[PDB]
Design a protein around this ligand. Structure first.
Ligand SMILES: CCCCCCCCCCCCCCCCCC(=O)OC[C@H](COP(=O)([O-])OCC(O)COP(=O)([O-])OC[C@@H](COC(=O)CCCCCCCCCCCCCCCCC)OC(=O)CCCCCCCCCCCCCCCCC)OC(=O)CCCCCCCCCCCCCCCCC
Ligand SMILES: CCCCCCCCCCCCCCCCCC(=O)OC[C@H](COP(=O)([O-])OCC(O)COP(=O)([O-])OC[C@@H](COC(=O)CCCCCCCCCCCCCCCCC)OC(=O)CCCCCCCCCCCCCCCCC)OC(=O)CCCCCCCCCCCCCCCCC
Ligand SMILES: COC1=C(OC)C(=O)C(C/C=C(/C)CC/C=C(\C)CC/C=C(\C)CC/C=C(\C)CC/C=C(\C)CC/C=C(\C)CC/C=C(/C)CC/C=C(\C)CC/C=C(\C)CCC=C(C)C)=C(C)C1=O
Ligand SMILES: CCCCCCCCCCCCCCCC(=O)OC[C@H](COP(=O)([O-])OCC[N+](C)(C)C)OC(=O)CCCCCCCCCCCCCCC
Ligand SMILES: CCCCCCCCCCCCCCCC(=O)OC[C@H](COP(=O)(O)OCCN)OC(=O)CCCCCCCCCCCCCCC
Ligand SMILES: CCCCCCCCCCCCCCCC(=O)OC[C@H](COP(=O)(O)OCCN)OC(=O)CCCCCCCCCCCCCCC
Ligand SMILES: [Zn+2]
Lengths: 49, 122, 11, 443, 406, 48, 406, 57, 48
């Protein structure tokens, strides 16, 4: 068994970001969540500064 | 809960059926699931106990054909295309291959839905 | 198998 | 031309010996039973296990006839004979062809009233008793029930095993058995009953001929009356772990109702409400019990049975679960106790269905003459009369849903339990978590 | 006491009047494992009892019977399929209607076979296979008779008949000329009228035809680590009172509860291995054949071998002459056992054979017990020992004997 | 975080609206590069 | 091409000279399933070969053999235990030393048995049980010979011998007087010297004792849904050239690749079922017994039955008057078929059986082929058909025939 | 997926192979190229294939 | 939170230092009440 499927934290990362079954025909309208996360991170950092 | 389509009420009066047939034909043409070759019964949701049980009571050939139809539709939707005008689903092949089984399962479940509520009138 | 231990102290 | 169920007559022989017969006109076989109201409760800490030893030694010779003169007196005429003992009564019954009973009765009387126990016979039967005790440990049901009885009425004579301790078996002498005969075999506490093709008058004549010499007991009491202190129900737990057993047997019980309690048939009705189940049953998915449905859908166990064991001054009321899905035992226990607690708000259709099922099943388990004779003997031994079916129907009819709710609230709702587990019970949670499920918190 | 045959509206009836408060109703269909076309079809057809009919679903049949307080049971033998239902006497008409509907219209839904029927058959077959003694007796039955009644009653693990085969067999078997009706309620005339009125819509087909039984011999061997068994088997013609008398004379089971016994097998075991191996014998009647078997069990293979040799010698000793007292004891014991095999309302292997045969099954059979003489038993034993027997050995095979060493 | 952990138990939908259990691909090589275009486009939008 | 036995230092030897760059070394031991004390002991004892010895662990043995470039292979049969080693000619001394050490001193660690030996034996047993033809032939052997070679070879699924039993069986089975050493390298004198030097400290025990084989007959029936099978088995005494010529006369396969053949069985199949059921005959020679078997296989049960009947009729007619040309062709084919079994280095039934008995072996056994007359074959055939044969049926049992209906 | 990943990883590792593994493989290959020929049919087939594919044995 | 997640995968130790995979009890109510006493004592101290 590979490391990414054995260590707890790496397994947590892998189950959500690396190995996760997804529909194979989702359009470009399914990317807005990542944009929301990036904007939220930018807001948090800029507000802290 | 569940779809509440009232076509049975309309079909009692032949006047309404004769008047509404062209509108229904135009609406079914406009919905445009035939362009992907799918049958109407492939679009119903299968995430509850009733539909998951009904899908296990289908003939094997029907299940294999449904799997092929859904796979072809997904592969078509990946690259944003449709089937040519000769391979569209003809009205002859657009029949109800899932409604009777689901109705039977719902009737069985409804059957039990009565013994528990039974009361003694004395 | 033994007999029941006496629990009368804590009862 | 419809015929009717034959009533059971009853007479006393000026000595307390009660005889009950259910004549069957067109019958070819017959059964004669002789029971005594003295089980394993009358024993003490020293002479425990004397009842089973005494029963084992009955068919080994008398003063008149010796061994190999009893078998040749029974095998020749085609007459089976058998006996067994319980925690409160011991029984003897012999069945033979229509013409062979009038001699089986005489031989049974000769065996019971008169006897001879030799030291050689005891020294021979000791090894047989030891082998029986060594064998009995293998069966799961007997071990589980014995442990439950020991852990429920701990410290009381009702909490011992019928076989007795292994140490006591190799120490009993003939004097203790003779004392048991002299004390607990009396005409006030004995009974005969037949349920075959032998007429009541003929049985009365045979009983007067071969039993009219017994001495009534000094303490002239009734039949089935309590004798001693009322045992105290003590909630506890016993875990006999064994990791090599594929299954895991668990028994959970609460305090039940005695034979004379005015809430007997209500407890029976609730037991019928819970019912029993088995994975091999043809109609398993279609049972009308919530516990059956929830267990079957998730395959939480292999079977379960509900019992209502009752004694003279106490009883037990619970369930016996056998499971093979090690890992979901806690779910099974929680759901079982939740369904137990739900009886406080039971509906009216469930009560009627259980009443009908109990009325059907009460008088449907008596087909052979042996079963009818045993039922007559037990019913006369415990209470003192054999209730007519009209009385049973009247008593069952009085039951309503509010009586069930009251009994479940006063007996099951948040009360102490006594459990006993055997096998692979690693997944069975501890006592407090088990008990917490017997009282629902939503209300 | 004994069922009286009758025929009303082309229906075979057999009633009995008893003074009780309950009753019984059964149909004895001649569609057992003897007549099955393929393997396991009879078992699945029997398991389809009380399923969704044309007028009711399984939910109704179960829940409403529970509401009425009754028990429904089914049974499968090597020659019969029995559908029975016990009830309080107040509900005769309903259960007659239910049995008639189950027999006549029992629509076979394709999705029930894969959901409710097949797993039950698998579980039953596994439970049967776990029992060693039942497997040994089935193997002895298969070795003795060739294929008529020597088939396999239960469904093997490598079989899966289609619903079409079961439907065809049901359409060929469930006919008015291929079963009977057995009732033992407190009223007979009313039950007879009800059965005649209700069991009159099933089409009148023809009884199933099977070839006469073929008798042979053979020996099977198998290994096991637990207790060891060694079973003998003597195929015999149609059952007669002499055979029952001989089976009771051989004995093996004690009369008194805690004892050894004075029958030939008990004495043989006692003088052979100090009661370290037990030998019992019994007879299983059939439609046109019978099988008398001797079973020797224990944990010491040497003791089993010795007691088997002693029992065979004792059985061979019966061909010269028999003392009268042995004959009297055997007659008494056989009569007691035969009459006690009738008390329960459930049809066992003895009552069913008496009922199916219409030539004085029980009324004259009892009278034939008292006419047994030592000459008749000697002749029966002599005719039994002509052909060799069939043996099945379970356990240590290097000590368990063959037939030639007995 | 609760939003994502609640979503992950059943997966995303598709434009067709039918079950997507028949055809699936892992997220690592494919959907980690289909989101980069949107990220860069958003950056070019916000920097202006 | 022929093994010439010797005896150096009280050790059986069998040398052979070949012009090859690779040798071999096999130790044939009389410890097969015929001599086992309990079920599965021989198989487990064979599995323990090449495990932790008294001088080097199993890991060391495997790594050393891998580094030296050699293959270590064992083989368990119904009457022997064979441990082989194929190598380049340089490492002959090392491989002889390794084999001698393995046979002489091999400590039995219980955890090794519970870890590696048992799972491998179980896996091999399941792999054998999956196949159908091998099970049929094993059952044919079981029904033909009562004990000895009639014992099951592989470990039963419900058995587990203790380590002490295997240890004592190995102690009383691995002795100088109970095995032989076979080498077929490019030099015999050097191999003989090395074998005498290293296989010399093993104790002078006693040969294992077994009773002479007892021959009987019987029929067994099993059920399956796939390809149907039907086998006939004729037990016979020790093998003779007449039996080999008869087996080659029966034939069954095709001389050229894509054809039907022109032997008796092929003609029978063609005339009966239009080549819808292939029939094949073969012979398995043992030390003091032999089994001439006919295997009829196909998918259509009716074709199987017709082919079986026609084949038995042809075999019966084979005893009347055999034409000379048939005998000539049979001898010509049998010579090649017997000789072709000696080219492979690994031993088979024929070579091992020839090597066990030093009276004839292979020097004079081949020479006797050319002195077979039709009268001798007719006498052998007529002697075979005196006692009843034995059958094993797999598939639909309602059509496959018993022996009385052939 | 784990099986394929480990198989391809052991494939790719061969760029840093050690001397001992190479020696063991050489010995095993030299033994195996000769242990196969054990019958006349096998030798004839080997000779025929070698002559047909290369030109010489 | 990561501390707790890392600890949960192997359980806690015992004073003896030996394995405790033989006699285990669930957290509630056996260890959800043992903490209340310490909570109240710390509350008393901080409040004073
Ligand atoms: C050469 C000439 C011009 C070319 C230059 C274009 C270059 C850049 C544009 C990018 C582009 O078109 O391709 C990317 C993109 C790549 O394709 P894809 O994402 O893989 O395909 C998506 C589906 O397959 C498409 O599926 P479909 O077409 O079958 O379905 C129709 C489609 C849309 O298609 C249409 O029907 C319209 C497009 C028609 C084109 C113009 C017609 C004008 C006459 O449906 C949607 O996607 C709708 C999205 C649903 C919601 C999103 C918007 C809602 C806003 C929320 C409002 C407020 C919230 C209220 C709630 C709050 C209350 C509290 O193409 C499209 O999807 C084009 C459709 C329109 C989306 C982009 C619009 C941007 C501007 C373009 C205008 C078109 C002229
Ligand atoms: C206000 C009180 C609400 C607390 C919930 C409660 O009474 O337990 C659930 C319990 C449901 O179980 P049930 O059907 O009534 O039967 C009770 C059994 O004994 C079932 O009892 P059990 O032995 O299965 O014990 C269950 C109990 C375990 O025992 C505890 O109380 C756990 C304590 C942990 C932290 C305390 C909070 O769990 C709970 O108390 C529920 C979860 C506790 C908090 C969840 C944290 C995240 C969600 C927000 O009560 C209700 O939810 C009904 C309403 C009761 C009060 C409102
Ligand atoms: C299958 O389907 C799904 C997909 O879809 C198809 C997916 O896409 C996804 C996968 C992708 C996602 C959408 C998941 C991601 C989305 C979320 C989980 C949303 C949650 C977002 C957050 C939790 C935001 C977190 C951001 C934080 C914590 C901001 C903090 C930043 C810093 C600590 C570093 C920046 C530094 C700052 C601001 C400080 C100022 C800078 C300095 C240099 C001064 C500070 C210096 C010091 C104090 C020195 C001392 C420092 C020390 C020792 C302390 C350590 C250092 C610190 C700075 C803390 C999923 C799951 C899926 O299901
Ligand atoms: C500064 C911010 C970035 C700082 C650096 C950020 C990147 C940090 C490293 C990337 C993330 C960590 C790697 C995660 C995947 C992994 O675990 O790879 C380890 C591999 C072996 O992993 P495996 O494929 O599963 O094989 C082992 C399987 N067994 C045999 C155990 C069954 O073993 C290997 O071959 C490699 C082991 C290396 C372990 C990480 C070392 C830490 C990085 C050192 C610095 C590298 C140089 C950095 C230059 C920029
Ligand atoms: C964070 C806390 C700060 C506030 C502190 C004050 C809280 C007031 C609580 C009042 C006393 C409890 C009465 C319940 C008694 C009861 O009902 O016990 C019943 C239950 C279960 O027993 P049973 O049903 O199986 O019994 C079976 C009967 N036959 O036991 C409990 O659930 C214990 C709950 C106690 C409260 C939780 C304390 C632990 C939280 C702190 C540790 C974790 C910190 C996490 C970070 C904050
Ligand atoms: C705004 C800032 C964003 C980051 C800036 C750009 C980062 C570098 C991008 C340029 C190089 C890309 C790698 C080329 C492909 C490759 O080389 O590898 C290919 C790998 C797949 O691996 P494979 O094994 O299948 O490849 C085949 C065999 N080797 O695909 C990638 O890794 C994609 C890298 C993109 C990084 C993630 C972008 C999406 C962010 C999602 C945010 C989710 C929420 C986050 C919340 C904080
Ligand atoms: Zn006893």
């Amino acid at each position: 068994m590979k490391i990414l499927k054995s260590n707890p934290f790496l397994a947590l990362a892998n189950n959500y970001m690396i190995d996760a079954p997804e529909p194979s025909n989702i359009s470009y309208f399914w990317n807005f969540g990542s944009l929301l996360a990036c904007v939220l991170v930018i807001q948090i950092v800029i507000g802290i500064l | 809960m569940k779809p509440v389509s009232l076509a049975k009420y309309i079909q009692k009066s032949p006047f309404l059926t004769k008047l509404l047939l062209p509108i229904s034909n135009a609406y079914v043409h406009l919905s445009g699931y035939r362009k992907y070759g799918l049958r109407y019964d492939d679009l119903m949701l299968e995430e509850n106990d009733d539909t998951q049980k009904a899908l296990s009571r289908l003939p094997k050939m029907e299940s294999y054909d449904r799997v092929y139809r859904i796979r072809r539709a997904m592969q078509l939707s990946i690259e944003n295309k449709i089937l040519p005008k000769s391979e569209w689903t003809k009205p002859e092949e657009d029949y109800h291959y899932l409604r009777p089984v689901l109705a039977e399962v719902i009737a069985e479940r409804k059957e039990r839905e009565a013994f528990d509520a039974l009361i003694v009138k004395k | 198998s033994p007999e029941m231990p006496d629990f009368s102290e804590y009862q | 031309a419809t015929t009717a169920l034959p009533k059971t007559e009853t007479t006393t022989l000026k000595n307390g010996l009660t005889v009950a017969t259910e004549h069957h006109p067109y019958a070819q076989t017959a059964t004669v039973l002789v029971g005594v109201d003295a089980g394993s409760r009358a024993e003490t800490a020293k002479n425990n296990g004397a009842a089973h030893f005494l029963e084992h030694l009955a068919f080994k010779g008398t003063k008149n006839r010796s061994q190999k003169a009893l078998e040749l007196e029974f095998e020749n005429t085609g007459a089976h004979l058998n006996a067994y003992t319980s925690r409160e009564q011991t029984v003897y019954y012999a069945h033979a062809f229509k013409n062979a009973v009038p001699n089986a009765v005489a031989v049974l009387a000769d065996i019971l009233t008169n006897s001879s126990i030799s030291a050689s016979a005891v020294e021979r039967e000791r090894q047989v008793i030891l082998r029986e005790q060594e064998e009995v440990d293998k069966m799961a049901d007997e071990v589980v029930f014995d442990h439950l009885h020991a852990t429920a009425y701990q410290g009381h004579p009702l909490g011992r095993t019928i076989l007795g301790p292994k140490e006591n078996i190799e120490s009993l002498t003939r004097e203790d058995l003779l004392q048991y005969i002299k004390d607990n075999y009396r005409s006030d506490r004995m009974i005969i009953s037949s349920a075959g093709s032998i007429s009541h008058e003929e049985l009365v004549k045979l009983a007067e001929k071969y039993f009219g010499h017994l001495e009534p007991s000094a303490e002239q009491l009734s039949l089935g009356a309590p004798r001693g202190l009322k045992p105290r129900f003590v909630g506890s737990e016993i875990r006999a772990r064994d990791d090599d057993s594929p299954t895991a047997n668990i028994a959970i019980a609460v305090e039940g109702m005695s034979w004379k309690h005015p809430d007997y048939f209500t407890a029976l009705v609730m037991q019928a409400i819970i019912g029993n189940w088995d994975r091999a049953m043809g109609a398993s998915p279609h049972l009308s019990s919530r516990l059956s449905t929830i267990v079957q859908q998730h395959q939480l166990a292999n079977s379960f049975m509900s019992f209502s064991t009752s004694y003279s001054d106490t009883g037990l009321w619970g369930i016996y679960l056998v499971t093979e899905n090690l890992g979901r035992i806690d779910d099974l226990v929680h759901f079982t106790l939740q369904n137990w607690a739900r009886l406080t708000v039971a509906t009216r259709a469930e009560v009627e269905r259980a009443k009908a099922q109990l009325r059907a099943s009460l008088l449907l388990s008596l087909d052979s003459t042996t079963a009818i004779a045993e039922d007559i003997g037990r019913q006369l031994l415990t209470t003192g009369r054999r209730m007519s079916p009209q009385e049973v129907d009247l008593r069952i009819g009085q039951i309503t849903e509010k009586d069930v709710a009251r009994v479940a609230s006063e007996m099951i709702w948040d009360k102490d339990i006594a459990v006993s587990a055997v096998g692979s019970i690693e997944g069975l949670l501890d006592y407090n978590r088990i008990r917490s499920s017997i009282s629902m918190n939503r209300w | 006491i004994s069922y009286t045959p009758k025929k009303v509206e082309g229906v075979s009836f057999a009633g009995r009047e008893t003074p009780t408060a309950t009753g019984s109703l059964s149909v004895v269909i001649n569609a057992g494992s003897r007549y099955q076309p393929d393997a396991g079809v009879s078992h699945l057809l029997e398991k389809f009892a009380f399923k969704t009919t044309e007028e009711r679903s399984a939910l109704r049949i179960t829940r409403e019977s529970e509401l009425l307080g009754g028990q429904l049971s089914t049974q499968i033998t090597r020659e019969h399929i029995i559908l029975t239902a016990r009830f309080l006497n107040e509900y005769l008409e309903y259960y007659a209607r239910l049995l008639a509907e189950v027999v006549d219209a029992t629509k076979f839904l394709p999705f029930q076979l894969t959901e409710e029927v097949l797993p039950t058959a698998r579980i039953e077959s596994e439970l049967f296979r776990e029992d060693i003694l039942r497997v040994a007796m089935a193997k002895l039955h298969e070795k003795a008779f060739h294929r008529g009644i020597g088939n396999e009653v239960y469904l093997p693990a490598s079989a899966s008949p289609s619903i079409s085969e079961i439907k065809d067999f049901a359409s060929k078997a469930y006919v008015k000329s291929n079963f009977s009706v057995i009732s033992s309620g407190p009223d007979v005339q009313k039950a007879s009228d009800l059965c005649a009125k209700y069991f009159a819509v099933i089409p009148d087909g023809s009884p199933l035809k099977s070839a006469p039984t073929k008798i042979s011999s053979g020996e099977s061997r198998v290994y096991s680590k637990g207790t060891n068994y060694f079973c003998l088997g003597f195929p015999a013609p149609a059952a007669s009172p002499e055979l029952f008398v001989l089976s009771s004379i051989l004995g093996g089971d004690a009369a008194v509860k805690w004892s050894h016994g004075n029958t030939l097998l008990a004495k043989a075991a006692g003088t052979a291995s100090e009661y370290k191996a037990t030998a019992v014998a019994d007879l299983t009647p059939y439609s046109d054949a019978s099988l008398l078997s001797v079973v020797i069990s224990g944990s010491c293979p040497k003791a089993i071998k010795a007691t088997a040799s002693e029992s065979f010698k004792a059985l061979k000793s019966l061909s010269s002459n028999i003392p009268n007292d042995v004959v009297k004891s055997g007659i008494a014991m056989a009569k007691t056992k035969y009459l006690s095999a009738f008390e329960p309302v459930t049809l066992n292997a003895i009552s069913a054979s008496s009922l199916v045969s219409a030539s004085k099954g029980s009324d004259a059979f009892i009278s034939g017990f008292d006419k047994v003489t030592p000459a008749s038993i000697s002749k029966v034993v002599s005719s039994l020992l002509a052909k060799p027997a069939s043996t099945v050995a379970v356990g240590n095979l290097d000590v368990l004997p063959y037939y030639d060493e007995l | 975080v609760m939003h994502l952990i609640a979503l992950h138990t059943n997966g995303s939908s598709n434009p067709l609206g039918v079950t997507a259990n028949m055809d699936r691909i892992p997220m690592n090589p494919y959907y980690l590069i289909k989101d980069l275009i949107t990220i860069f486009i958003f950056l070019i939008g916000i920097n202006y």
